[PDB]
Design an enzyme around this catalytic site. Structure first.
Site, PDB file in Angstrom:
ATOM      1  N   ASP A  35      -5.677  -1.488  -4.824  1.00 47.89           N
ATOM      2  CA  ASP A  35      -4.284  -1.214  -4.500  1.00 47.89           C
ATOM      3  C   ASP A  35      -4.147   0.171  -3.870  1.00 47.89           C
ATOM      4  O   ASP A  35      -4.102   1.179  -4.587  1.00 47.89           O
ATOM      5  CB  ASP A  35      -3.455  -1.309  -5.783  1.00 47.89           C
ATOM      6  CG  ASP A  35      -1.976  -1.061  -5.560  1.00 47.89           C
ATOM      7  OD1 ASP A  35      -1.560  -1.042  -4.393  1.00 47.89           O
ATOM      8  OD2 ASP A  35      -1.246  -0.883  -6.574  1.00 47.89           O
ATOM      9  N   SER A 199       4.674   3.883  12.337  1.00 47.41           N
ATOM     10  CA  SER A 199       4.442   2.945  13.411  1.00 47.41           C
ATOM     11  C   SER A 199       5.331   3.291  14.599  1.00 47.41           C
ATOM     12  O   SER A 199       6.439   3.791  14.440  1.00 47.41           O
ATOM     13  CB  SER A 199       4.742   1.528  12.915  1.00 47.41           C
ATOM     14  OG  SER A 199       4.661   0.575  13.955  1.00 47.41           O
TER      15      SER A 199
HETATM   16  N1  LIG Z   1       1.256  -1.457  -4.561  1.00 49.93           N
HETATM   17  C1  LIG Z   1       1.921  -0.577  -5.564  1.00 49.93           C
HETATM   18  C2  LIG Z   1       3.376  -0.984  -5.782  1.00 49.93           C
HETATM   19  O1  LIG Z   1       3.831  -0.448  -7.023  1.00 49.93           O
HETATM   20  C3  LIG Z   1       4.274  -0.483  -4.670  1.00 49.93           C
HETATM   21  C4  LIG Z   1       5.289  -1.282  -4.168  1.00 49.93           C
HETATM   22  C5  LIG Z   1       6.187  -0.797  -3.235  1.00 49.93           C
HETATM   23  C6  LIG Z   1       6.041   0.491  -2.806  1.00 49.93           C
HETATM   24  F1  LIG Z   1       6.902   0.962  -1.865  1.00 49.93           F
HETATM   25  C7  LIG Z   1       5.053   1.318  -3.263  1.00 49.93           C
HETATM   26  C8  LIG Z   1       4.167   0.820  -4.199  1.00 49.93           C
END
Ligand SMILES: NC[C@@H](O)c1ccc(F)cc1
EC number: 3.4.23.22
Length: 330
Positions: A35, A199
């Protein structure tokens, strides 16, 4: 040093990807969701509330000769999708694709929310955002990447996610056989702890490119592409019968549709997301209404280049002193 690991979709929709990770001595292999939008490495474990474990592989620190309790340390995290988990912390040896870090903080879950319990394919998360977001208290801990960085041949990792197919996470090197053309690099802000970039615009299908700055994050832990409402409306207006459904929670479209592609800008370069990548299938089993892979970020506060976008590219996360992001077609 380098590492190289295959990452595999958890289901037929590419809802997320799992990568095998070796933890402890002897190795305990868990399948983690890498992640780039968070900074905690946490696992289902022997400490997880029994009723909250349903098919996941667990880490048992008592069976690891290299595990050490990080005394007094706790963690607690809430994700963008509303899910959460919390527990205590060990340090142990962690290896990904042949790359080994000793003394990595491994956050052992005592509690996980229902969506984690309900997904038997994900044994935990491995965060790859900046360590400033790590939730361990009272002593914040470093990500796997930060711990590995000084030992890597080059201070980078790359994400090469597949569409309905396996892909690769590499650490410490750029595989020049894995992409076509050149890699275009773009500036990153680390101020919010994310791989945040801008972007240069978008196109819908064969339409003209609209030059416009779109600030967002490169987030392998988010399934979909979340963009400003104006952009998303322009996309779905090209699909007959598409509409935003408050009851479903976003844009849906007739499953009989052929979706247009979506192009996003990286500097003067362009990444094309094929229309098929934007189809997330029936909203419920047997329905002829399908869920869209491009959705509005309006209720989020940030635009998110999630898997739908990233899987269309070879992506370089450059963790040099001044970080940058690179994108290539593939
Ligand atoms: N992939 C981590 C999740 O908590 C997440 C979702 C949305 C975001 F704008 C940041 C992080």
């Amino acid at each position: 040093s380098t590492g190289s690991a295959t990452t595999t979709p958890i289901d037929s929709l590419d809802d997320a990807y799992i990568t095998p990770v070796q933890i402890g001595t002897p190795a305990q292999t868990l399948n983690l969701d890498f992640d780039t939008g968070s900074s905690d490495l946490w696992v289902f474990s022997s400490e997880t509330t029994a009723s909250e474990v349903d098919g996941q592989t667990i880490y048992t620190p008592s069976k690891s000769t290299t595990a050490k309790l990080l005394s007094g340390a706790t963690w607690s995290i809430s994700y963008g999708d509303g899910s959460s988990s919390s527990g205590d912390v060990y340090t142990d040896t962690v290896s990904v694709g042949g790359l080994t870090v000793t003394g990595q903080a491994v956050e052992s879950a005592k509690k996980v929310s229902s969506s984690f319990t309900e997904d038997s394919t994900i044994d935990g998360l491995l965060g790859l955002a900046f360590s400033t977001l790590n939730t361990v208290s009272p002593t914040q801990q470093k990500t796997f990447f930060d711990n590995a960085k000084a030992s890597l041949d080059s201070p980078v990792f790359t994400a090469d996610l597949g569409y309905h197919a396996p892909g690769t996470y590499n650490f410490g090197f750029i595989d020049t056989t894995a992409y076509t053309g050149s890699i275009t690099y773009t500036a990153v802000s680390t101020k919010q702890g994310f791989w945040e970039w801008t972007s240069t615009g978008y196109a819908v299908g064969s339409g003209t490119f609209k030059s416009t700055s779109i600030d967002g994050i490169a987030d392998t832990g988010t399934t979909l592409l979340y963009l400003p409402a104006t952009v998303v409306s322009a996309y779905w207006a090209q699909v007959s019968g598409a509409k935003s459904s408050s009851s479903v929670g976003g844009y849906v479209f007739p499953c009989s549709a052929t979706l247009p592609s979506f192009t996003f800008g990286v500097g003067s370069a362009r990444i094309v997301i094929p229309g098929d990548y934007i189809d997330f299938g029936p909203i419920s089993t047997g329905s002829s209404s399908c869920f869209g892979g491009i959705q509005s970020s309006a209720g989020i506060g940030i635009n998110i280049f999630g898997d739908v976008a990233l899987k269309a590219a070879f992506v370089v996360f450059n963790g040099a002193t001044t970080p940058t992001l690179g994108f290539a077609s593939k």
